[PDB]
Amino acid sequence: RVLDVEVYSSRSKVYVAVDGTTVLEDEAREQGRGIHVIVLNQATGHVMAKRVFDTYSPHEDEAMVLFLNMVAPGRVLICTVKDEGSFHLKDTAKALLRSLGSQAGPALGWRDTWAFVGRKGGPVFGEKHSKSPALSSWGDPVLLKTDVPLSSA
Ligand SMILES: O=[N+]([O-])c1ccc(O[C@@H]2O[C@H](CO)[C@@H](O)[C@H](O)[C@@H]2O)cc1
Numbered sequence: 001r002v003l004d005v006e007v008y009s010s011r012s013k014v015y016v017a018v019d020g021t022t023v024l025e026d027e028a029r030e031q032g033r034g035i036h037v038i039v040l041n042q043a044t045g046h047v048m049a050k051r052v053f054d055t056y057s058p059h060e061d062e063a064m065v066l067f068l069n070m071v072a073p074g075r076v077l078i079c080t081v082k083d084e085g086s087f088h089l090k091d092t093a094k095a096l097l098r099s100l101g102s103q104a105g106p107a108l109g110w111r112d113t114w115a116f117v118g119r120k121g122g123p124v125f126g127e128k129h130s131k132s133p134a135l136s137s138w139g140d141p142v143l144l145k146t147d148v149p150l151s152s153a
Contacts, residue, residue: 003045003148005126007115009080010141016078018045026052026082033083034060035114037067040076042119042151048075056084061093068096073121076148079105081114083138104129113139117146125149 006017016024016038026032034054041048049071053064071077077100086108097105101124104114111132118124126146130139 001150003040003076003150005076005078005117005144005146005148007078007080007117007126007128007144007146008141009082009113009115009128009139009144011083011111011113011138013141014080014082016080018047023047024050024080033085034081035064035085035089036080036082037064038078039071039120040078040148042074042076045076045148045150052082055089055093056087058088061089065093065096068120071120073119074151075120077116077118077120079114079116081108081112084111085114086110086112100124103127110135111138113142115142115144117144117148 008015013027014036037051039049053060055061094106101122113130115128117126125148126144128142128144130142132139
């Protein structure tokens with residue numbers, strides 16, 4: 001059928017809920033910065049992997065690329081930003097996000113918020129993005145609600 005997916009991105013908090021159950025939550029004050037990634041099985045919605053890449057810091061984007069490249073094309077892929085995910089989100093990682101169909105990922109900027117749900121090998125199911133209005137500010141919280149189709153048989 002479908003999965004009811006909720007993805008929240010903000011300065012101080014991320015969460016992901018699937019069918020009304022929270023599968024990822026991070027509101028720890030000075031922890032969990034960067035891009036949180038959840039991978040779901042495309043038939044059951046079970047969580048196959050959960051990661052966080054602190055892409056405000058060097059080398060985390062490289063780890064993110066190596067991880068995403070191992071994710072199977074049929075998987076549901078969910079990304080959400082806590083605090084800052086762009087400073088060291090460099091060209092190879094942005095090109096990979098573009099190849100998934102993400103519009104905001106390849107454009108991600110300083111303290112922007114971003115929530116994404118898509119099938120790894122395409123298409124994107126939902127995406128939201130808020131641009132930070134000033135270097136001293138963060139993007140607005142975004143809460144993406146998306147009905148994700150499930151595979152069967
Ligand atoms: O002047 N600057 O280049 C500059 C000024 C203030 C900055 O604050 C930091 O920003 C990070 C990303 O949001 C936060 O993780 C961190 O806790 C702190 O708030 C960073 C850079």
